[PDB]
């Protein structure tokens, strides 16, 4: 019963996110569209965090790596250091 990791972001999970976003009714094609959007979001952020890891010559991505990555994508996060 093999499955893509992206598909692990399930319809009901996406449905909950939408709900917190105040969405009442959801078209069927939205779930695939959302997974795509998340994938681009994560690629851009992880790419940058990993760049921060490599520069530091570590093999572990630290929270700070991510926080720095977020800060420079203009999506500042509070709660994880820095």
């Amino acid at each position: 019963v093999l499955r893509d990791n992206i598909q692990g972001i399930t319809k009901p999970a996406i449905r909950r996110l939408a709900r917190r976003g105040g969405v009442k009714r959801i078209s069927g094609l939205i779930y695939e569209e959302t997974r795509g959007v998340l994938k681009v979001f994560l690629e851009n952020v992880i790419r940058d965090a990993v760049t921060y890891t490599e520069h530091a010559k570590r093999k572990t991505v630290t929270a700070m790596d991510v926080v720095y990555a977020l800060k420079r994508q203009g999506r500042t996060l509070y709660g994880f250091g820095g």
């Binding site: 709660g79 250091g81 820095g82």
Partner: protein, 95 residues
Amino acid sequence: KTRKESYAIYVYKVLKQVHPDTGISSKAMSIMNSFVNDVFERIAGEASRLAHYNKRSTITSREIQTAVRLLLPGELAKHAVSEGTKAVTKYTSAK
């Protein structure tokens, strides 16, 4: 082992001055510390730019003041300026 500095103790003090009966979870304290680091960076960053624009070698309270004016919204700016001007006077007029 290596020293890890945080604004936490001083945040806790201020909380005690402002809601003496109220406490703070770790996670919230972590947020408050980010907030303090973030704002320092924003204000220092801008002060730094102002000094360069004007070919000065010093970041003075004047630069910090203008930085606050550029960065903070109106009412928040006004109070911050006065709080800050107030502390520099108090600091001067004390042996």
